[PDB]
Amino acid sequence: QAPDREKALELAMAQIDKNFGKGSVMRLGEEVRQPISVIPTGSISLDVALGIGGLPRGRVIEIYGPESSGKTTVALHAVANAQAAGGIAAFIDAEHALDPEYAKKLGVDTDSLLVSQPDTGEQALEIADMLVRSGALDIIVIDSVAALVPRAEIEGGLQARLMSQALRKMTGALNNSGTTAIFINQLREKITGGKALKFYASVRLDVRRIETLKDGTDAVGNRTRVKVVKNKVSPPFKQAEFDILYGQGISREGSLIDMGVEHGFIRKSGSWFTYEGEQLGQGKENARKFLLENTDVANEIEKKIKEKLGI
Numbered sequence: 460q461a462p463d464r465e466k467a468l469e470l471a472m473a474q475i476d477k478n479f480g481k482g483s484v485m486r487l488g489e490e491v492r493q494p495i496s497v498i499p500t501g502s503i504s505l506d507v508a509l510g511i512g513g514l515p516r517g518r519v520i521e522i523y524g525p526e527s528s529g530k531t532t533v534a535l536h537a538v539a540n541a542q543a544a545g546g547i548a549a550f551i552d553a554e555h556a557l558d559p560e561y562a563k564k565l566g567v568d569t570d571s572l573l574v575s576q577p578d579t580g581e582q583a584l585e586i587a588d589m590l591v592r593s594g595a596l597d598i599i600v601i602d603s604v605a606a607l608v609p610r611a612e613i614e615g616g617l618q619a620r621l622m623s624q625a626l627r628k629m630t631g632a633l634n635n636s637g638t639t640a641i642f643i644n645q646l647r648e649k650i651t652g653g654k655a656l657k658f659y660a661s662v663r664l665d666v667r668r669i670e671t672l673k674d675g676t677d678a679v680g681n682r683t684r685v686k687v688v689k690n691k692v693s694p695p696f697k698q699a700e701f702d703i704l705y706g707q708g709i710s711r712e713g714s715l716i717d718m719g720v721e722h723g724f725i726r727k728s729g730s731w732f733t734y735e736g737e738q739l740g741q742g743k744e745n746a747r748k749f750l751l752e753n754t755d756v757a758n759e760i761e762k763k764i765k766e767k768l769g770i
């Protein structure tokens with residue numbers, strides 16, 4: 460033998476990358492690259508947690524979690540962006556429970572949104588598969604990795620075969636075009652077709668609600684905690700928190716404050732948030748409305764926060 464572990468570690472470790480991929484071996488500390496592709500999630504907090512500024516384009520994302528925790532509110536946002544930037548979004552509904560005016564308020568352009576309501580789970584994966592091949596799409600989202608039942612099981616082993624099939628036959632395709640895919644999975648525990656997905660998924664988000672956003676009266680919404688358990692595009696395990704107001708989505712202004720203080724730019728103490736000499740207000744909800752009505756200063760915080768971190 461001879462070399463200093465390191466010089467022999469990164470040698471093989473590099474050997475690994477060549478043979479299996481990029482995100483194969485990683486040292487959780489790394490700042491590792493930035494592929495100019497990434498869909499903001501609307502949550503500066505989350506997409507800085509993803510390590511690239513948003514959900515990677517040309518990968519398959521899995522957003523699991525209990526109900527009423529936000530998974531979709533995110534996806535719906537996800538669409539809102541990659542769509543407000545010239546992209547074409549397709550939503551493969553198998554839940555039949557999408558609210559438009561909720562979406563309308565999050566930035567999605569419903570009218571130029573492709574909605575399909577498959578009959579089988581085998582069909583849903585196809586129109587999604589042939590639809591993802593036209594390269595026309597940017598972001599496609601399948602609602603309910605669960606509500607994708609095969610034909611049998613409606614006349615007379617299971618889905619994780621259907622899924623597995625669909626995934627292989629689609630992961631390849633998915634990236635030659637550049638369409639990142641989202642899958643909402645959910646309530647089969649709390650404290651189906653997994654297998655396949657749990658392994659193709661380049662990134663897996665754990666969206667669980669933590670607290671009901673009280674607002675003097677009863678409450679404006681809910682605060683969510685996402686844990687990116689699997690990340691192949693950067694270092695995994697980072698987590699992020701943010702607020703969701705009842706019918707108004709992820710609170711941008713509110714998200715900046717959190718980031719605005721945990722990184723300095725905004726000073727507290729006295730329950731009086733103050734952005735360098737200039738105060739905002741007393742009570743996160745009042746300095747939240749200060750940002751909400753002052754995009755000017757707001758941008759600046761958001762601006763500084765991204766420099767200080769991920770471009």
Ligand SMILES: Nc1ncnc2c1ncn2[C@@H]1O[C@H](COP(=O)(O)OP(=O)(O)OP(O)(O)=S)[C@@H](O)[C@H]1O
Nearest residue numbers: 526527528529530531532558561680681703705706
């Ligand atoms: N039409 C609506 N009106 C008001 N608030 C809504 C509406 N749709 C969703 N919300 C809020 O958004 C949050 C959860 O987003 P959901 O769509 O339920 O995401 P999940 O991803 O939690 O979804 P299932 O899986 O529960 S739809 C809740 O805290 C709700 O208050």
